[PDB]
Amino acid sequence: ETLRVDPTNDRLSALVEIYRMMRPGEPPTREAAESLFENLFFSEDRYDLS
Amino acid sequence: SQLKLLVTRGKEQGYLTYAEVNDHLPEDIVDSDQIEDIIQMIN
Numbered sequence: 001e002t003l004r005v006d007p008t009n010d011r012l013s014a015l016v017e018i019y020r021m022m023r024p025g026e027p028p029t030r031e032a033a034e035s036l037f038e039n040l041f042f043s044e045d046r047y048d049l050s
Numbered sequence: 051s052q053l054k055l056l057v058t059r060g061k062e063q064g065y066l067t068y069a070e071v072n073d074h075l076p077e078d079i080v081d082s083d084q085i086e087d088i089i090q091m092i093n
Contacts, residue, residue, distance in 0.1 A: 025080045 052076065057092065066092070 008014045015033035019026075022036060041047045056074030060066040071089060079085055 020077065024077055 053088075060092065 008017050012030060012033075015030070015037050016028045018040075019028040019033040019036050022040075039046050052074055053076065056066070056071065059070070059074075071092070075085060075088060
């Protein structure tokens, strides 16, 4: 059901959705969206489970 | 409609979490001042 409600289909459109939610209104890009998402949880200088 | 749904759902619930307001407030808004004014009016 979540994939029913889920409007996006692929990593590009999903990253764009994430970018719109985080940094809203700004026109997204492929590169800016990917960079924001990777800097969310998988860049070592911005996310630390101690 | 959206924020109207939020207002009516609140008025039937008697309360509103920050989460529900975030889900219901529009997506064009970027700054926090319009968001806090919306929260003030809605309160």
